[PDB]
């Protein structure tokens, strides 16, 4: 039986690609409840890992919205291997304004993981007439789309780089590009720039490709 | 449960750049039910009501809803001059009519810089190679990118959406996949870009071994 209009809305978010691929980092799944009325502000949360109920989840303080509604957030810390092995995370939301609870289930994108191929491209000859040059990192053939990409030099993330969102390729895998902008003088002086990638299908979940003149 | 949703789309970038082509703003209404027999559209250009839009007949979807589209032909000059287009959707089950507005992004237009990049030496182990077209420093984000080789179009390409850069301009990349043999043979490939801030709204950059 479906809910009538004007009731709460539930959005379930996956952990960050980086958090799942580093044992030091803590990956978490996020259950966000919107359109929570003032008349019925209490939201109850029930979490399930492959159908088995858990209790470690924390409910964040309810944020007051400009549109006169409440945003209620539940944060569940997940085990790195549990998320990667494809375990289903169910968030159950109970509220007085609801006729029946809303249930959202999140899992790592199903499908054979595919190893990204990482390629660094120097600036086009035509760009060498400019004050700033572009160093390109092509990351392709990866699955799922969850990836972390960074341009760095001398152990510093570079101040001026941008990465495109992943794009679905014709073979069902994904690709993206990350554009690093540097002053031409730094490129002409032989400084080494590196594109660092983290993905579940890379050996040791990490690869680094470096480029220089 | 929440009824219809409206999505208002800009014209195709190539349509606004070629006088021979007809640019249109499209007001799409989804989640229209069998109990929504009428879907009325009111259109405004800079808040002034216009009457030239055409509604297409409702189209049933596989999720048992209908999709209702209204198309408004726009002048190339009006879109490019930043006129605002508003679509208002109503019927007797819409106590609050739905309004959406669209216009070309405000700011000084900037010329795209087009750069072709060969495959990385590392990619030459694979049977298929990537030819890259970097298009940067353009404004607004409306742009068209295609590939050609020996007069004919190359269609085995994928282009990223425009990305907002650190200086307020946009960039994108277009990736053309070719068999290594075609690249090793010395065949010339071309990346063509259509944008308002290019000569005759078009430019082309070639790439060969």
């Amino acid at each position: 039986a479906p809910e009538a209009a004007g009731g709460p809305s539930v959005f379930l978010f996956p952990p960050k690609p980086k958090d799942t691929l580093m044992i030091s980092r803590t990956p978490e799944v996020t259950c966000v409840v919107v359109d929570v009325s003032h008349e019925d502000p209490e939201v109850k949360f029930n979490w399930y890992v492959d159908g088995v109920e858990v209790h470690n989840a924390k409910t964040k303080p309810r944020e007051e919205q400009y549109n006169s509604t409440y945003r209620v957030v539940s944060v569940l810390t997940v085990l790195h291997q549990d998320w990667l092995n494809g375990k289903e995370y169910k968030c159950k939301v109970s509220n007085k304004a609801l006729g029946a609870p809303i249930e959202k289930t999140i899992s790592k994108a199903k499908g054979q993981p595919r190893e990204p191929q990482v390629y660094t491209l120097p600036p086009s000859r035509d760009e060498l007439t400019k004050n700033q040059v572009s160093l390109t990192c092509l990351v392709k053939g990866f699955y799922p789309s969850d990836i972390a990409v960074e341009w760095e030099s001398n152990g510093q993330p570079e101040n001026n780089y941008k990465t495109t969102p992943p794009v679905l390729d014709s073979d069902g895998s994904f690709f993206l590009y990350s554009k690093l902008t540097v002053d031409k003088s730094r490129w002409q002086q032989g400084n080494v720039f590196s594109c660092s990638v983290m993905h579940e299908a890379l050996h040791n979940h990490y690869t680094q490709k470096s480029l220089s003149l | 449960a929440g009824g219809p949703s409206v999505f208002l789309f800009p014209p195709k970038p190539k349509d606004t750049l070629m006088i021979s082509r007809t640019p249109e703003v499209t007001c799409v209404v989804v989640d229209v039910s069998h109990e929504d027999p009428e879907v009325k559209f009111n259109w405004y250009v800079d808040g002034v009501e216009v009457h030239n839009a055409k509604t297409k007949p409702r189209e049933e979807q596989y999720n048992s809803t209908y999709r209702v589209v209204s198309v408004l032909t726009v002048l190339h000059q009006d879109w490019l001059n930043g006129k605002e287009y508003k679509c208002k959707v109503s019927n007797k089950a819409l106590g609050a009519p739905i309004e959406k507005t669209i216009s070309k992004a405000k700011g000084q237009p900037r010329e795209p810089q087009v750069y072709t990049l060969p495959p990385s030496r590392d990619e030459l182990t694979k049977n298929q190679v990537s030819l890259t077209c970097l298009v940067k420093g353009f404004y607004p984000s409306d742009i068209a990118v295609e590939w050609e080789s020996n007069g004919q179009p190359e269609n085995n390409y994928k282009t990223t959406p425009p990305v907002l850069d650190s200086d307020g301009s946009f960039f994108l990349y277009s990736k053309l996949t070719v068999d290594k043999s075609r690249w090793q043979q010395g065949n010339v490939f071309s990346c063509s870009v259509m944008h308002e801030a290019l000569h005759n709204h078009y430019t082309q950059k070639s790439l060969s071994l």
Epitope: S68 | G3, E35, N91, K92, A93, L94, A96
Partner: antibody
Framework: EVKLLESGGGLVQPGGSLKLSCAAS????????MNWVRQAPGKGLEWIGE????????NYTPSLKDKFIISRDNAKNTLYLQMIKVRSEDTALYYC????????????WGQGTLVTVSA | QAVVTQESALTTSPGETVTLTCRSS?????????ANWVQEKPDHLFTGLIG???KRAPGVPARFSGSLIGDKAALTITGAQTEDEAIYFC?????????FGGGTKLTVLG
């Protein structure tokens, strides 16, 4: 919370005129159509009319179109009903009614204001 | 103008299914009539239940549903509750005006 509060009711002489108000709060009043509906003693509901958010269209029960004038002032979050040359049959509770965003056109009702037409 | 007719009164019992109807004097009730249903409780407390033939207002229980049956509009209550005791009005849209029916008083037995 959606709130509609009618005012301006009371005693009016036959042949008299009266203007009712409906103060809205808890929502963006400028987004919605608004209705006026009445209920005379021992009778059912009778629609009076409605007004678009921008006031470009005002609809009325055909038989009542020369007896009532609907208007609104979005900046003041207020709906109005001008009643002119009232008769005994106009004695009734007058309700302002807001549709929900989608679906129910008579969703949110004020408590009503009683107009008594009497000498 | 057009006249809208409903049953004067109907009786049901807790857990039963009851159907209220709404007829148009102009002929068959269509989706273009955007049938509406309103519930009236004591102290003149009105709440809209349905609009656009079958769309429930926010907070309306799932036991209330709207539909069209051939030439009439209908409000079905599936698994009636004692709290459903009320007067139910229907309203139909006629191109430029709404017309309310006479209302149906619902008695819940037991």
């Amino acid at each position: 919370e959606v709130k509609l509060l009618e005012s301006g009711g009371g005693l009016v002489q036959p042949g008299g005129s009266l203007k009712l108000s409906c103060a809205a709060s808890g929502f963006d009043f400028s987004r919605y159509w608004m209705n006026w509906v009445r209920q005379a003693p021992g009778k059912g509901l009778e629609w009076i009319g409605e007004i678009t958010p921008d006031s470009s269209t005002i609809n009325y029960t055909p038989s009542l179109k020369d007896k009532f004038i609907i208007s609104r002032d979005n900046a003041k979050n207020t709906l109005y009903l001008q009643m002119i040359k009232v008769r005994s049959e106009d004695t009734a509770l007058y309700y302002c009614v807001r549709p929900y965003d989608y679906g129910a056109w008579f969703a949110s009702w004020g408590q009503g204001t009683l107009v008594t037409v009497s000498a | 103008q057009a006249v809208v007719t409903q049953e004067s009164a109907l009786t049901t019992s807790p857990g039963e299914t009851v159907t209220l109807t709404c007829r148009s004097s102009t002929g068959a009730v269509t989706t273009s009539n955007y049938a509406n249903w309103v519930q009236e409780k004591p102290d003149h407390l009105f709440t809209g239940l349905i609009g656009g033939t079958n769309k429930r207002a926010p907070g309306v229980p799932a036991r209330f549903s709207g539909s069209l049956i051939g030439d009439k509009a209908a409000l079905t209550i599936t698994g009636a509750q004692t709290e459903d005791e009320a007067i139910y009005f229907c309203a139909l849209w006629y191109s430029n005006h709404w017309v309310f029916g006479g209302g149906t008083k619902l008695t819940v037995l037991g």
